[PDB]
Scaffold this active site. Structure first.
Site, PDB file in Angstrom:
ATOM      1  N   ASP A  50      -1.131  58.456 -77.993  1.00 21.66           N
ATOM      2  CA  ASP A  50      -1.295  60.111 -77.853  1.00 21.66           C
ATOM      3  C   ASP A  50      -1.648  61.351 -76.996  1.00 21.66           C
ATOM      4  O   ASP A  50      -2.374  60.758 -75.929  1.00 21.66           O
ATOM      5  CB  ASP A  50      -3.028  60.214 -78.762  1.00 21.66           C
ATOM      6  CG  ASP A  50      -3.500  61.068 -78.858  1.00 21.66           C
ATOM      7  OD1 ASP A  50      -3.003  62.602 -79.246  1.00 21.66           O
ATOM      8  OD2 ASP A  50      -5.050  61.653 -79.262  1.00 21.66           O
ATOM      9  N   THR A  51      -1.045  61.522 -76.860  1.00 24.86           N
ATOM     10  CA  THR A  51      -0.763  62.126 -75.734  1.00 24.86           C
ATOM     11  C   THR A  51      -1.199  63.613 -75.523  1.00 24.86           C
ATOM     12  O   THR A  51      -1.192  64.389 -74.088  1.00 24.86           O
ATOM     13  CB  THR A  51       1.118  62.938 -75.827  1.00 24.86           C
ATOM     14  OG1 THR A  51       0.917  63.726 -76.002  1.00 24.86           O
ATOM     15  CG2 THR A  51       2.209  61.920 -75.309  1.00 24.86           C
ATOM     16  N   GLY A  52      -2.388  63.166 -76.260  1.00 28.54           N
ATOM     17  CA  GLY A  52      -3.131  65.298 -76.590  1.00 28.54           C
ATOM     18  C   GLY A  52      -4.474  64.657 -75.434  1.00 28.54           C
ATOM     19  O   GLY A  52      -5.416  65.189 -75.598  1.00 28.54           O
TER      20      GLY A  52
HETATM   21  C1  LIG Z   1     -11.384  62.833 -72.781  1.00 29.13           C
HETATM   22  O1  LIG Z   1     -10.623  62.086 -73.440  1.00 29.13           O
HETATM   23  C2  LIG Z   1     -10.199  62.563 -74.967  1.00 29.13           C
HETATM   24  C3  LIG Z   1      -9.268  62.207 -75.744  1.00 29.13           C
HETATM   25  C4  LIG Z   1      -9.393  62.461 -76.760  1.00 29.13           C
HETATM   26  C5  LIG Z   1      -9.653  63.872 -77.510  1.00 29.13           C
HETATM   27  S1  LIG Z   1      -9.658  64.139 -78.920  1.00 29.13           S
HETATM   28  O2  LIG Z   1      -8.991  63.325 -80.340  1.00 29.13           O
HETATM   29  O3  LIG Z   1     -10.781  64.972 -79.604  1.00 29.13           O
HETATM   30  N1  LIG Z   1      -8.139  65.092 -78.791  1.00 29.13           N
HETATM   31  C6  LIG Z   1      -8.528  66.306 -77.758  1.00 29.13           C
HETATM   32  C7  LIG Z   1      -7.528  67.931 -78.326  1.00 29.13           C
HETATM   33  C8  LIG Z   1      -6.293  67.899 -78.103  1.00 29.13           C
HETATM   34  C9  LIG Z   1      -7.970  68.027 -79.739  1.00 29.13           C
HETATM   35  C10 LIG Z   1      -7.014  64.547 -79.150  1.00 29.13           C
HETATM   36  C11 LIG Z   1      -6.003  64.572 -80.663  1.00 29.13           C
HETATM   37  O4  LIG Z   1      -4.764  64.479 -80.504  1.00 29.13           O
HETATM   38  C12 LIG Z   1      -6.737  64.287 -82.006  1.00 29.13           C
HETATM   39  C13 LIG Z   1      -6.793  63.060 -82.093  1.00 29.13           C
HETATM   40  C14 LIG Z   1      -7.915  62.613 -83.298  1.00 29.13           C
HETATM   41  C15 LIG Z   1      -6.664  62.021 -83.901  1.00 29.13           C
HETATM   42  C16 LIG Z   1      -6.652  61.945 -85.193  1.00 29.13           C
HETATM   43  C17 LIG Z   1      -7.969  61.886 -85.926  1.00 29.13           C
HETATM   44  C18 LIG Z   1      -8.803  62.141 -84.429  1.00 29.13           C
HETATM   45  C19 LIG Z   1      -9.019  62.269 -83.739  1.00 29.13           C
HETATM   46  N2  LIG Z   1      -6.354  64.747 -82.384  1.00 29.13           N
HETATM   47  C20 LIG Z   1      -6.330  65.726 -83.911  1.00 29.13           C
HETATM   48  O5  LIG Z   1      -7.938  66.058 -83.594  1.00 29.13           O
HETATM   49  C21 LIG Z   1      -5.747  66.243 -85.089  1.00 29.13           C
HETATM   50  C22 LIG Z   1      -5.410  67.051 -84.344  1.00 29.13           C
HETATM   51  C23 LIG Z   1      -4.145  68.086 -85.602  1.00 29.13           C
HETATM   52  C24 LIG Z   1      -4.341  66.835 -86.627  1.00 29.13           C
HETATM   53  C25 LIG Z   1      -5.533  66.296 -86.787  1.00 29.13           C
HETATM   54  C26 LIG Z   1      -5.908  65.747 -86.172  1.00 29.13           C
HETATM   55  C27 LIG Z   1      -5.308  65.271 -88.767  1.00 29.13           C
HETATM   56  N3  LIG Z   1      -7.031  64.422 -88.768  1.00 29.13           N
HETATM   57  C28 LIG Z   1      -5.059  66.187 -89.098  1.00 29.13           C
HETATM   58  C29 LIG Z   1      -3.875  67.474 -89.614  1.00 29.13           C
HETATM   59  O6  LIG Z   1      -3.467  67.415 -88.403  1.00 29.13           O
HETATM   60  C30 LIG Z   1     -10.760  64.153 -76.485  1.00 29.13           C
HETATM   61  C31 LIG Z   1     -11.043  63.787 -75.259  1.00 29.13           C
END
Ligand SMILES: COc1ccc(S(=O)(=O)N(CC(C)C)C[C@H](O)[C@H](Cc2ccccc2)NC(=O)c2ccc3c(c2)[C@@H](N)CCO3)cc1
Lengths: 99, 99
Positions: free
Chosen positions: A25-27
């Site tokens: 997860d690059t985000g």
């Molecule tokens: C300091 O460390 C962190 C690490 C991760 C995070 S995070 O998980 O909250 N997130 C940060 C921002 C960019 C939103 C990054 C991830 O990309 C996040 C991870 C995730 C994936 C799946 C389930 C829960 C969390 N991705 C999303 O929030 C996300 C984004 C889009 C998305 C979906 C999820 C799907 N559930 C439905 C459709 O599209 C925050 C702080």
């Protein structure tokens, strides 16, 4: 390897003795794992994402095998619905985004 | 472009007439932007992030300019802390992850 993005970039990791699946997860600034048992002191921490803020436990210098490569770094543990491998560990694999 | 992950992979995008900064996010299935007004109609949708589920607006066929590239796909609009580009657009860029 080269990993396309037509599906979720999911890999096999080994942490705390247990094999698990996790998302590359690059985000994610940091690595976040679903509630599990990990040894050693941790420190409370708050991270924020799409569902708002969640409280996690921060573990330092935790060894993780990702696809057979041992890396080490900070691990956050908390009620995430999915195991997430953050940039803090992806750098250690030498991982890049290419287009 | 080959992007290392020692820092957040931020890019400038053009969408809905406007210039915006967004995060390249392999852990996001879908693209999600903070409140914005986009061309076209939308339908409601529930998406799940690290803190739980949230209501967003789904716009289909939104054109987007990303790093000298033109793409088009579904864009979700809602309470995200940062603009994120998800796999649905990154596949159109030809993004891959490489160790
Ligand atoms: C300091 O460390 C962190 C690490 C991760 C995070 S995070 O998980 O909250 N997130 C940060 C921002 C960019 C939103 C990054 C991830 O990309 C996040 C991870 C995730 C994936 C799946 C389930 C829960 C969390 N991705 C999303 O929030 C996300 C984004 C889009 C998305 C979906 C999820 C799907 N559930 C439905 C459709 O599209 C925050 C702080």
């Amino acid at each position: 390897p080269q990993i396309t993005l037509w599906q979720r970039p999911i890999v096999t990791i080994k942490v705390g003795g247990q094999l698990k699946e996790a998302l590359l997860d690059t985000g994610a600034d940091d690595t976040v794992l679903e509630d599990m048992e990990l040894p050693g002191r941790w420190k409370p921490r708050m991270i924020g994402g799409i569902g708002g803020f969640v409280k996690v436990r921060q573990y330092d210098q935790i060894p993780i095998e990702i696809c057979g490569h041992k890396v080490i770094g900070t691990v956050l543990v908390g009620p995430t619905p999915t195991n997430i491998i953050g940039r803090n560990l992806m750098t250690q694999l030498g991982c890049t985004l290419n287009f």
